[PDB]
Structures are given as structure tokens and as C-alpha cells.
Write a protein that holds these residues in place. Structure first.
Motif, PDB file in Angstrom:
ATOM      1  N   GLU A 166       0.857  -1.126  -0.017  1.00 45.74           N
ATOM      2  CA  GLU A 166      -0.009  -0.060  -0.109  1.00 45.74           C
ATOM      3  C   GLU A 166       0.808   1.118   0.072  1.00 45.74           C
ATOM      4  O   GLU A 166       0.594   2.151  -0.885  1.00 45.74           O
ATOM      5  N   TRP A 167       1.648   1.229   0.856  1.00 43.32           N
ATOM      6  CA  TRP A 167       2.851   2.535   1.149  1.00 43.32           C
ATOM      7  C   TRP A 167       3.557   2.755  -0.100  1.00 43.32           C
ATOM      8  O   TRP A 167       3.832   3.933  -0.659  1.00 43.32           O
ATOM      9  N   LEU A 168       4.104   1.517  -0.782  1.00 46.68           N
ATOM     10  CA  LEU A 168       4.775   1.530  -2.011  1.00 46.68           C
ATOM     11  C   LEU A 168       3.923   2.224  -3.089  1.00 46.68           C
ATOM     12  O   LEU A 168       4.228   2.997  -3.722  1.00 46.68           O
ATOM     13  N   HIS A 169       2.649   1.955  -3.240  1.00 45.97           N
ATOM     14  CA  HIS A 169       1.780   2.729  -3.995  1.00 45.97           C
ATOM     15  C   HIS A 169       1.583   4.026  -3.897  1.00 45.97           C
ATOM     16  O   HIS A 169       1.720   4.849  -4.712  1.00 45.97           O
ATOM     17  N   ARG A 170       1.458   4.348  -2.622  1.00 45.91           N
ATOM     18  CA  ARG A 170       1.269   5.833  -2.253  1.00 45.91           C
ATOM     19  C   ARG A 170       2.413   6.676  -2.477  1.00 45.91           C
ATOM     20  O   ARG A 170       2.401   7.568  -3.248  1.00 45.91           O
ATOM     21  N   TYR A 171       3.587   5.907  -2.233  1.00 51.06           N
ATOM     22  CA  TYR A 171       4.948   6.607  -2.655  1.00 51.06           C
ATOM     23  C   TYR A 171       5.168   7.066  -4.082  1.00 51.06           C
ATOM     24  O   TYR A 171       5.753   7.996  -4.583  1.00 51.06           O
ATOM     25  N   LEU A 172       4.652   6.178  -4.935  1.00 52.22           N
ATOM     26  CA  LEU A 172       4.731   5.859  -6.324  1.00 52.22           C
ATOM     27  C   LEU A 172       3.877   6.924  -6.697  1.00 52.22           C
ATOM     28  O   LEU A 172       4.404   7.520  -7.853  1.00 52.22           O
ATOM     29  N   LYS A 173       2.651   7.212  -6.482  1.00 52.80           N
ATOM     30  CA  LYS A 173       1.716   8.217  -6.539  1.00 52.80           C
ATOM     31  C   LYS A 173       2.347   9.676  -6.256  1.00 52.80           C
ATOM     32  O   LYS A 173       2.199  10.545  -7.215  1.00 52.80           O
ATOM     33  N   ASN A 174       3.042   9.976  -5.128  1.00 56.06           N
ATOM     34  CA  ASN A 174       3.723  11.118  -4.620  1.00 56.06           C
ATOM     35  C   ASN A 174       4.651  11.519  -5.709  1.00 56.06           C
ATOM     36  O   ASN A 174       4.901  12.541  -5.624  1.00 56.06           O
TER      37      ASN A 174
END
Lengths: 175, 9
Positions: A166-174
Motif C-alpha cells: 500500500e505504502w509503496l503505491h502511495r509513494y509511487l503516486k507521490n
């Protein structure tokens, strides 16, 4: 294409003198993005790239407290391993942990990692199945027996298959 | 976000 997140944590006791120096560095797609150093004037996680400045103060406060807990964990376990390897106190030793996840194009977990090394030697590692452990030597077998009985693999798997992705995807979005 | 090791050696 695939993406990855990793944290590398190290704790070093210098000459048994004082508190271990603790560092944690996070990477996304082989790019450093956050970092904690216990030796800093006031130790906190800091963003190492501009796309991380999107996270509010609560994020930083929270992960900083996680680092604070990890310091204690490393302190205790450095002592434990001094015991397992029958080493004399007062020396210089390092304990390292690497963990994180690789996800596919699909955005789904391809591989999880959770592994520990002592004095630059493998100690214990979670296998690709995220269920069984590779113990590098006889000392690590003690830990493995404890960890098999305590369900440690399930504990780490909960993070690896949940939060990590989840966090990986959030950071990829950031980014 | 980082995680706790938690389990003792």
C-alpha cells in the motif's frame, strides 16, 4: 513495470561505549527517499527527496516513533547475540535488518523480504514462501526455533502483504 | 512506512 521498496536498518555498538548508533534508510525503486540517524542533533526521519514533503507532520512524528522503538529492539538483540556467539562485552558489533517488497506491473506482491545479518554475516532470513526460515548457523537456529513457535513469519507477512504494498503505491503516486 | 522487528532473537 515492477517496483520495489526496501528499508535497511543498522545498529552498531562502538567499543561497548554508550548507545548503539542506529540508522535506517528507505529506498523506492533504488532511490533513497527517507532516512533516520541516531547520531543527528535531534534524531527524526527526514525526507531525502522533494516528493516526500507531501506527507504531513503526523506521518513524520509516527515513523520517527517507530525508529525510536527499533533502537531499543536493536540494543536488546545486540546483547542477545553477544550471548549466542559467546563474545566478550566491550567490543564492536553490528546488527543489520533488510526488509520490504517487490510488486509487479499488476501492482501485486511479487516478493517479500525480511532478513537479518550480524557482524556482516547472514543470521536469519525469511524464505520466499514468507512462511519458513533459513538459519545461517547454529546460533540462528535458536532464534528460528523461537520464531517458528511464535508465528513470527505470519507477523512479518502481515506487513509484507499489507502495509508494504500500500505504502509503496502511495509513494509511487507521490513521486 | 517502516515496520517493527518486534520478535526477540
Amino acid at each position: 513495470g515492477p517496483h520495489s521498496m526496501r528499508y535497511y536498518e543498522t545498529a552498531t555498538s562502538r567499543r561497548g561505549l554508550g548507545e548503539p548508533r542506529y540508522t535506517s534508510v528507505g529506498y523506492v525503486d533504488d532511490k533513497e527517499f527517507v532516512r533516520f540517524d541516531s547520531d543527528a542533533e535531534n534524531p527524526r526521519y527526514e525526507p531525502q527527496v522533494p516528493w516526500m514533503e507531501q506527507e504531513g507532520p503526523e506521518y513524520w512524528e509516527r515513523i520517527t516513533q517507530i525508529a525510536k522503538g527499533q533502537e531499543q529492539w536493536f540494543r536488546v538483540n545486540l546483547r542477545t547475540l553477544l550471548g549466542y556467539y559467546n563474545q566478550s562485552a566491550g567490543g564492536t558489533h553490528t546488527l543489520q535488518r533488510m526488509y520490504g517488497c517487490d510488486v509487479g506491473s499488476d501492482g501485486r506482491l511479487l516478493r517479500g523480504y525480511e532478513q537479518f545479518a550480524y557482524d556482516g554475516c547472514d543470521y536469519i532470513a525469511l524464505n520466499e514462501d514468507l512462511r519458513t526460515w533459513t538459519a545461517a548457523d547454529m546460533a540462528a537456529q535458536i532464534t528460528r526455533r523461537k520464531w517458528e513457535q511464535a508465528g513470527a513469519a505470519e507477523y512479518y507477512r502481515a506487513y509484507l502483504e499489507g502495509e508494504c504494498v500500500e505504502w509503496l503505491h502511495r509513494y509511487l503516486k507521490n513521486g | 512506512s517502516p515496520s517493527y522487528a518486534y520478535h526477540q532473537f
